[PDB]
């Protein structure tokens, strides 16, 4: 090709010479362009050069901070221009490294300084800048500035992540996910820091510790990453009942998501608001995707962390750069404080949901995520979030794993982020104002003024000043619970209570969802060495559901004693046996919209398929990759040239939500084994796949006989009816009734 | 089944409560046994309760520090018995956790100040202890006192890694490997920190920071984790020719080895050898492994980075507990002072290797690695490693590579590992005396006497004292080099050569190694979303070997250019044109002991061929796992109950080297879709394939034919001739006569 | 956690129990103790759930507070009776 | 930035109760105190410090192309911090002392830092020797006396075996 031919400006010893000067390609075809775009059809960039014209008041308040560099000089961190950034200082060209090369030290001395702790969980996550605005004043139930005026648009931080791997661990790994939102409020920061289920798996954060060591890799040897597959997990399980609600929830495909788009959100425990009447109302926090609900299955998720660890990473990033915006709504469900008592469950015990069929999640705002950030250390790495940073129209509650957290994420950020002024860290500063008494510490950026230190003063007219609790801007102050008893360490009764809920759940998910339940608690205990781990958990789940128990004893070759098939199932939750609302799928939600295709081309591609094809995605916003068994470019039938994203292997079909085949020279792939796995395991994973013309050929390689099945979409040609049945099966996300077909596909 | 009924002790509020007391089976199976036993006959453990009788010098002096707990009481640090460690202090049982709880805030300040910064690069690791010997006295070239008596042990410390990604990221990665291992000596520690290869991708150390930032997820968006087949990678690259040579080291299937056990180690570096008589002779260190040079193919360690991220971690200490240690001759090429000059490439280079065809290769002792850690994070992670760990006997030359490694590995444990007192943690700490006149800094243990913390001093009688140089326990001389020189910043004209050794590794492979060579390339740069970074990089292979550059180029879909056709090769290397100690598999080498094979079992299994094939591969000392549907057991045709290891997606065949069916009852597993394709991932794979009686029905999945074909070993029963053909296979590695065979298989 | 350096402190030697220590604290910067339990948590059947909790008693046993009464609104307020 | 209503008292369950571990504002207060210290400089820890200005008489470019002495319209803030050696943050001012000079130029091509001392030579020829002689001088460290003072025996001793001292 004419413009494909670049040679390297490189070929001689000039590469350990300064002077490389200018190196872009002279066609520019190096920078991506500053507007949205669609995953794959640019490089990816910083936030700041991919959106420029995307802004809010954080954004911009990071202006001071942010460095360029084009048109700059190298220099040292003195300022120091360097002339030869390409060696030492010797004696001699063949000498010694001499000790006055400050240059060089300098260099290194940053290079070998450059990694801080990782956070001691949810060490992998994945985050984004945008924005947050309330449908209307909530000024009746709390005075939270934030809430209080549906024109009044807060800025916010969004962190999403694992629970157990390291920050180099894999994304679509089976685990809880974290779900953390700083916002920058004009009464403060408020980070809202949930995760993807409703409960924790824990009671009293004095157990934090020894839950998390069960989880996390063995001691001994530090395997496994990732997984909660393996005897110390599953033994602390065994022993703990009250850890049953979440590993139901984690072995559900709740513990796969197909996208942090496509998870809920939730702050878990109850917390308070207070109005400007000083009247309480307990409220559990929820985020909706607008996307809807969608999981991977087990045996993709896991293939997937090793075809592309980075999946949910990338997946976020290039939806935001191609102005597919994560969002979701806001959500509380409020109890008033005389309803305490009138549940089954005790409201301060985070192993309990509250059911929506009780208390609805009633809708509060609207947030979206629309700007990656620019340097993923400095924003990311570095963002402290803590559910203890509340303003005035929030309080806390006595639920015993909340008042740990509050200790702890303040406790923290003194090691990981290197002394007690991490707030000055620029994506956590406060965009209001603040002040205080406090001074020094490690990396103190804030240069006082103020005479005095200390207050009450008289030397600086007592200012900065206490502010009176009001009904706006006002002082914070603790609503006035009334506590009696004596100091113990001890659970209350009304959380032991442990089987009801698991079974609240089970009962809740559609056949499938219970399949693939059984099927996540088969798979991790068979990698649990001692079989009396094993044995032990089923007789948890024999208290739980003995369809279930039965079903997972049977992949572990458990018979259940005459006894457990006998135990009385645990009661209903306030009359409830279900609640659709706890299954993934029961209620169809959501939309194909930043769904992606794989398009399977040949050598000469029939293009009114793939027009028609590309038309009908386009128009509702589901992206294509064009595949191919080489990378370059193909020719079609009528000259159109077509550029190859990847390859069957690149790209493999984990990667997308749906494959069609267009017509064209099928017998050009009709023998490729990579196309034919490609199908086989689109097929396997509950994928729809769409044939056109000769394409139709490959039901052979997935057993599908003449006459078709549902979820596989069939035509002469591509001009359909064909797109409108592939989008409908998009829409439902994965083909459930073939479920019972795969058993015999190998793949 | 009686005895595999285990039913858990804990089903109500007793698990919210102190007492718990024992909770261990009666039957004992919770504990492993303190013997060798083979990968997965029981949980793995502590080395020290392991093997207690597998012992040196380092090891019984970390007894000083190890720490039990069997019928120890539960404290806090400072020795507090806790009557209850499952709840917090708060005033009433449903009330808010009181500041005065020490026990609470004790655990979980611990807890929250776990992490430590990782490595800066090569993070991600695995360790063992073990002990090294010289095969005979090296006084006359050394005397460095570990070399000086065959009988004088050396315990060792090793730590095996990778180089990109995190201490969370995976084991099989397409990377090169750290091999770095401590020396305890009589004369001080000495650490050789090398690498799998026999070079380095770069010339300077000033550039160490470039190329890291290169290679390492990119700084927008932290992506991608563990690979360089990304941009700025390839970008590098194609600009810095230098360092073409380690990459096509890292494009062959050297980078993706199958073992830590089956790779080489090189110290990349020229080095000094110092003898008593002050004779310096050029030295490069070299690493054989007993098990011989084995690796992986790129699709099966991509996919077992998500099946099992942790499988080279797993294998080391699997081995290590089987009582299979891996084992290393220690090798040094040897160049006399006066041939500085005689090669074509400079010794100070250390992007250029020595070929063992110009410079052989010779043995000097051996290491066994024969105990596992106890504790993953005290042992491993902060063990400090430093090139610039010398002794006498040894010294350094002008590499400006290794003059740069001097200064950073002692500067980045001052973060790594908090302060300067990193020598004072157990596991770095020398077994012979060390004595000086520091004091003080972060976290210090030794409790100096001396009157005195300077030098010279009257009030202790000078004492520590220096100590003259000499031919045994004398002090630190370097060696007197002369050096002329002016002071500049300039790379040496010899090293100025980037083509030659890449095409003289490249002509060294076997054709089924370049093919991977190739496909590795391919791969990358297809992931490279600048199409002109692929351009450049096919310009660089075109000045290495035109057959090479052709081939990428077609699957990257880039047409050469004439004047590229016309690009006259690189020169021979001093007379050589190839050497086969480059290729991996070139000379046969190595051993099947260690090796693993699945055994895919049914529910009547012909017990007559199970033993035949059992008892062969014990006398090889190849393992087996067995595998099924489902957990538990399964009976054979004469009644012997067979335990299962793992099911066919558990254990997948990327976790063993062969596969073997035995006969029975077939039909039980022929229509199974995870046992067809366990087949069909081996047959891919190049694996060997074993199928006995009716299991040879199974060459119908993998499309071979009624008359076989080499490398699947077939017969009506599981005889002698089976399993020795069989076991001649696995001696080979893999089938690479199968490779124009799998492209049309499915898998 | 800043003027020693991280949450091993008492591994110091000055700082050291004479009387026994063992719980399920691992990790943190300058770790000395090198822990041989297979568990590093609790409950747990894996080593037979040791160390154990001790119950309180005359000598010997474990730590317990002091059930004192508490009856009052969260409020930040000095107490009449310190003016 | 949330404000605070009273920042004289500790939230308690009744006014004369227990402490609560949700008072946020009273942790992240002791907690920003609980870490106000750095550690000092190893040497001349005790120190004074200003801001000002530097401008040269005239141009130096016949002997150095250094920026700020180009021009007399050069001017050059600088940060300037005087100092003793040996003793620590919180000792004495007029002690017996070598003192520091240390002034940084922020120059239009870099920081320069010319950190010098109020006498013309060093006491040691080598830096190898510098934690030597440093610990020499310094608090002597079983009792850690004297404070601020080279008036005792292990100074004395260093200064009697190194002439090169001396001057
Ligand atoms: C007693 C300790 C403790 C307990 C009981 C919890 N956590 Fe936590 N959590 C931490 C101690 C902690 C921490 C150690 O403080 C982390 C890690 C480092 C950090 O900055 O906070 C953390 C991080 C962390 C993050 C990551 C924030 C980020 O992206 O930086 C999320 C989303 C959560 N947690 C969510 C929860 C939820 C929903 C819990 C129960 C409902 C929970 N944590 C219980
Ligand atoms: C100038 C900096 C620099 C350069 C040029 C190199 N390295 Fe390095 N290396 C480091 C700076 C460094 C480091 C930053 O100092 C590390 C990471 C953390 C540590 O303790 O040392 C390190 C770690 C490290 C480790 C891991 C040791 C362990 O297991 O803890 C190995 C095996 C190597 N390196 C090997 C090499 C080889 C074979 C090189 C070239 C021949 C090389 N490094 C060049
Ligand atoms: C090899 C080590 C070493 C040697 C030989 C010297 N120093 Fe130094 N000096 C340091 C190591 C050091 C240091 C440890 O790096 C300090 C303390 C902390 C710091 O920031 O620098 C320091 C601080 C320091 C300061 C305080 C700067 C400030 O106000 O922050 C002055 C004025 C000097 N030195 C001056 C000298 C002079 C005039 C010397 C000989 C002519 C000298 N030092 C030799
Ligand atoms: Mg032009
Ligand atoms: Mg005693």
Chains 1, 2 share one sequence.
């Not at 009746?140 to 009044?152: E, R, V």
């Not at 049953?244 to 559900?252: D, E, I, R």
């Not at 098939?565 to 209620?587: E, F, H, M, R």
């Not at 086989?680 to 099945?709: C, N, S, W």
């Amino acid at each position: 090709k004419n413009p494909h031919q670049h040679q390297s400006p490189l070929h001689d010893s000039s590469e350990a010479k300064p002077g490389m000067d200018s190196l872009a390609p002279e066609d520019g075809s190096h920078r991506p362009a500053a507007e949205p775009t669609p995953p794959g059809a640019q490089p990816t960039a910083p936030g700041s050069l991919k959106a420029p014209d995307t802004r809010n008041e954080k954004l911009n308040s990071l202006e001071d901070v942010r460095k360029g560099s084009e048109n700059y000089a190298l220099t040292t961190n003195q300022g120091v221009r360097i002339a030869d950034d390409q060696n030492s200082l010797r004696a001699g060209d063949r000498g010694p490294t001499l000790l006055e090369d400050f240059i060089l030290r300098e260099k290194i001395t940053h290079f070998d300084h450059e990694r801080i702790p990782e956070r001691i969980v949810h060490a992998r996550g994945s985050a984004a800048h945008g924005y947050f605005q309330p449908y209307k004043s909530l000024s009746d139930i709390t005075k939270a500035d934030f809430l209080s005026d549906p024109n009044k648009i807060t800025p916010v931080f969004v962190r999403f992540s694992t629970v157990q791997g390291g920050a180099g661990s894999a994304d679509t790994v089976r685990d809880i996910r974290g779900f953390a939102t700083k916002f920058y409020t004009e009464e403060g920061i408020f980070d809202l820091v949930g995760n993807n289920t409703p409960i924790f798996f824990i009671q009293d954060a004095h157990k934090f510790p020894d839950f998390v060591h069960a989880v996390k890799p063995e001691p001994h040897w530090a395997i496994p990453q990732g997984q909660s597959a393996h005897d110390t997990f599953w033994d602390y399980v065994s022993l703990q009942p009250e850890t049953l609600h979440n590993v139901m929830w984690a072995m559900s495909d709740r513990g796969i998501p197909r996208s942090y788009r496509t998870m809920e959100g939730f702050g878990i425990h109850t917390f308070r608001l207070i109005n400007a009447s000083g009247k309480a109302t307990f409220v559990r926090f929820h985020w909706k995707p607008l996307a809807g609900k969608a999981s991977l299955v087990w045996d993709e998720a896991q293939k997937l962390t090793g075809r592309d660890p980075d999946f949910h990473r990338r997946e976020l990033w290039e939806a935001i750069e191609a102005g597919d915006f994560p969002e979701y709504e806001l959500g509380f469900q409020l109890i008033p404080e005389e309803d305490e008592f009138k549940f089954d469950f005790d409201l301060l015990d985070p192993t309990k949901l509250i059911p929506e069929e009780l208390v609805p999640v009633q809708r509060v705002g609207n947030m979206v995520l629309n700007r990656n950030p620019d340097n993923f250390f400095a924003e990311n790495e570095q963002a402290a979030f803590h559910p203890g940073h509340i303003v005035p129209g929030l309080d806390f509650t006595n639920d015993p794993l909340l008042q740990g957290r509050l200790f702890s994420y303040t406790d923290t950020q003194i090691s990981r982020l290197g002394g007690p002024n991490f707030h000055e860290i620029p994506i956590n500063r406060p965009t209001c104002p603040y002040h205080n008494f406090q001074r020094d510490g490690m990396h103190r950026m804030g240069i006082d003024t103020n005479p005095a230190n200390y207050e009450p003063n008289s030397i600086n007219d007592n200012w900065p000043r206490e502010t009176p609790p009001g009904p706006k801007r006002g002082g914070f102050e603790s609503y006035q619970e009334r506590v009696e008893g004596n100091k113990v360490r001890e659970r209350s009764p009304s959380f032991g209570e442990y089987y009801s809920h698991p079974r609240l759940f089970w009962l809740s998910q559609t056949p499938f969802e219970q399949r693939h339940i059984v099927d996540g608690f088969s798979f991790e205990l068979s990698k649990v060495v001692r079989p009396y781990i094993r044995e032990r958990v089923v007789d948890q789940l024999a208290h739980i559901d003995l369809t279930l128990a039965q079903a997972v004893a049977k992949n572990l070759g458990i018979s259940l004693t005459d006894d457990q098939l006998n135990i009385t199932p645990p009661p209903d939750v306030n009359g409830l046996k279900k609640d659709p609302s706890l299954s993934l799928y029961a209620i169809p939600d959501g939309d194909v919209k930043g769904r992606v295709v794989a398009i399977l081309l040949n050598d000469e591609v029939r293009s009114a398929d793939l027009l028609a094809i590309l038309k009908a995605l386009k128009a509702k916003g589901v992206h294509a990759k064009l595949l191919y068994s080489r990378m370059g470019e193909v020719t079609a039938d009528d000259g159109t040239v077509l550029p190859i994203a990847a390859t069957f292997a690149g790209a493999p079909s984990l990667t997308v939500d749906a494959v069609i085949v267009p017509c064209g020279n099928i017998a050009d792939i009709a023998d490729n084994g990579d196309a034919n796995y490609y199908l086989m395991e689109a097929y396997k994973h509950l994928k729809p796949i769409a044939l056109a013309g000769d394409a139709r050929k490959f039901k052979a390689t997935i057993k599908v006989a003449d006459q078709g099945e549902e979820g596989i979409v069939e035509a002469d040609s591509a001009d359909g009816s064909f797109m409108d049945e592939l989008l409908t099966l998009m829409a439902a996300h994965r083909v459930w009734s073939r479920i019972p077909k795969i058993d015999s596909i190998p793949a």
